[PDB]
Structure formats: C-alpha cells, structure tokens
Amino acid sequence: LLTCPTPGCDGSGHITGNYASHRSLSGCPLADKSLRNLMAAHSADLKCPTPGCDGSGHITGNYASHRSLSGCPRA
DNA sequence: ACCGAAAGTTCAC
C-alpha cells in the first residue's frame, strides 16, 4: 500500500520473510508460504540509511515515513 | 536461470 503498490500488502514482511524492506518487485507477503516466527539473522533496512537516525519522526514532525532525502531528525 | 531483496532516485503535494 504505502510502501509497495500492492493494496493488500502493507510493505512490512516479505515473501520469504528473510527481510522487511520491500516497495517494488521484491516480496509482497500476500499469500506467502508460511515462514516468520522468530526467524532472526535478516539484514533489511526498514528505516533511513542514516545510522544516527532510527526512522521515527520527521524533521518537521508532521509525518513519520522517511527513508531517503525526506527528513531525518538526527544524525 | 530465476526469484527475491535492496539502493539510490524521482514525482507530487
């Protein structure tokens, strides 16, 4: 939806469940094949590339979604 | 060879 163009999907999770970041032809967990639980060791960046930033909150604080040149309220 | 995930980037409000 906000992340990927898929209305049913929300952008969180993945087809394989080995990640979280997805907004294109990556892995929309619609049907899936059942794989989540506690499956650790998954390299995904859900948030912005900024190490100091965590992705929460914006520079103006009027929004929350930021993962590029939008609004990191920190380093 | 095919499928999935991620980077960097770009358009609209």
Next chain:
DNA sequence: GTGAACTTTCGGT
C-alpha cells in the same frame, strides 16, 4: 521543503 513512490542492479537459491 517534505513526503511518498518506482525502476533497476546485485546477490542468493
């Protein structure tokens, strides 16, 4: 100025 959204490339299976 800020937020929000797309295409393409690389890596893994």
